[PDB]
Structure formats: structure tokens, C-alpha cells
């Protein structure tokens, strides 16, 4: 069940399997099925080549997988290049949306290195 | 760390031609269980493993 170069789970309902492509979430998926008139409830393994064909055409109009990864990477490269405050936070591994850093912020900083 | 359940069997029956090894045998194995298979030779211990 390869779509946009991603082998979507065959056993899962269509709405859910679509979300395995980088750049598609639950709502996005429902629209694609809505636009392409496919039932959400059918399992991916049970999809006909026609329905699969239709889904693939619609998904080509969205920015997914490498496309999206390249777009977002440029955004990060842009912020640092212009020497923004946000750029500095990104490269330094600190919160960029004003979260306090005295406590928490372990998603950005990684595991504690006690001293 | 992983999840609780790892093996479940419901109404599990294994036959060879006309010989029933075991029939309607429900059991489970959870994470971290240390299970000893007890039984005489030929009772099907290795058979169950190959099924698992």
C-alpha cells in the first residue's frame, strides 16, 4: 500500500492509514477521502486500484514527505541566517516560544546531565 | 519497557490427524512472566512453542 512513497498500514481504516504520510493529519485525511469520495471505514487492504488511484492524485497536490521536510528545514535555516532571536534559540537548544527554562524544557534540552 | 499482554490463547486446540494433543486450552502470558512448561515427553510442549 505505497502512497507518496509511504507504505501506509494495510490493515487500518483508510482515515488512519493516510495519517502515516508526513504532512497529513486526521482532518486532512477526512478531506482527501471526502474529496475522493472513498469510505472512511474500509480497510486499506480492501481498497480497489481505482480508489487508491484517486487518493494518490489528490495527495500530490499537498506538500508531504520530502517536500514538507525541505520547506520546514528552510524555515529553520532562514531564522538562523538572519540572526534572529528565534534562530539563536533553535541552534542553542532552548525554548523558542518564551517558555521558562529554569525548570522543565527537557524536550529541547534532552536528558538531565546532573552536576 | 513494553506492554502487559504478550500471549493469549482462547479455545486453543491442536490435533495431528486424529490425535488431539490438547483441546479447548485457554491460557495467557504477560510481560515478565517466567513460565515453566511441565508435562511428560510427547505431551506437546515443543508443539505449543512452534505455534507461538
Amino acid at each position: 500500500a505505497r502512497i507518496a512513497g509511504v507504505d501506509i498500514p494495510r490493515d487500518k481504516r483508510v482515515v488512519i492509514s493516510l495519517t502515516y504520510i508526513f504532512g497529513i493529519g486526521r482532518t486532512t485525511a477526512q478531506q482527501v477521502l471526502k474529496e475522493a469520495g472513498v469510505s472512511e471505514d474500509t480497510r486499506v487492504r480492501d481498497l480497489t486500484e481505482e480508489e487508491l488511484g484517486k487518493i494518490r492524485d489528490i495527495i500530490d497536490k499537498l506538500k508531504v514527505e520530502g517536500d514538507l521536510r525541505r520547506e520546514v528545514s528552510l524555515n529553520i535555516k532562514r531564522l538562523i541566517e538572519i540572526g534572529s532571536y528565534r534562530g539563536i534559540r533553535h541552534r542553542r537548544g532552548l525554548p523558542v516560544r518564551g517558555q521558562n527554562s529554569k525548570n522543565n524544557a527537557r524536550t529541547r534540552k534532552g536528558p538531565r546531565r546532573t552536576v | 519497557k513494553r506492554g502487559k499482554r504478550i500471549i493469549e490463547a482462547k479455545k486453543l486446540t491442536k490435533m495431528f490427524d486424529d490425535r488431539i494433543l490438547f483441546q479447548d486450552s485457554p491460557f495467557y502470558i504477560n510481560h515478565g512472566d517466567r513460565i515453566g512448561l511441565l508435562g511428560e515427553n510427547g505431551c506437546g510442549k515443543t508443539t505449543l512453542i512452534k505455534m507461538i
Binding site: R78, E81, I82, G83, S84, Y85, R86 | -
Partner: protein, 83 residues
């Protein structure tokens, strides 16, 4: 985040300074305290010395900066790591 209806905000006292520099095609270092001012296209090429709390930091404005706030390029806190 500023409502689109309101439009981008930029302290007029700073915009006025840039309009005079643009009419004469001149490029002086404009000292400002308006960290909150949006970078408009009109600023491109100029050098604005933005107060960071103790000194005006000259920040060169490139095209890629338009829409950000002046303050965004003049960090106010000093930190070179613990040790």
C-alpha cells in the same frame, strides 16, 4: 499575532526617520528604542541601532527580515554558559 485588520505596527517616529532617509537616498545609522517596531520593506538596506536595554546595537536590515520586530534581532540578555 497583531490582527490583520489593524495592519502591521511600526512606531511612526521611526517610520518618519526612514522616510526622510529614503527621500534623499541616504543611509545613516538611525538610533531607536522601538524594539517593538515591525521591519517593513522600506527599511531594507538601512542600519538601525536598536536599544537592547543598555546600548544601541547596529542591526543591518536584509530583505529576509521584513515582518519581524526590530527587537527580535537585538537580544537583551547576556549568557555565555555555566561552568
Amino acid at each position: 499575532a497583531r490582527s490583520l485588520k489593524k495592519g502591521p505596527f511600526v512606531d511612526g517616529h521611526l517610520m518618519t526617520k526612514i522616510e526622510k532617509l529614503n527621500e534623499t537616498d541616504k543611509k545613516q545609522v538611525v538610533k531607536t528604542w522601538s524594539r517593538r517596531s515591525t521591519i517593513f520593506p522600506q527599511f531594507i538596506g538601512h542600519t538601525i541601532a536598536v536599544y537592547d536595554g543598555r546600548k544601541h546595537v547596529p542591526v543591518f536590515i536584509s530583505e529576509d527580515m521584513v515582518g519581524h520586530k526590530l527587537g527580535e534581532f537585538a537580544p537583551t540578555r547576556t549568557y555565555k554558559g555555566h561552568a
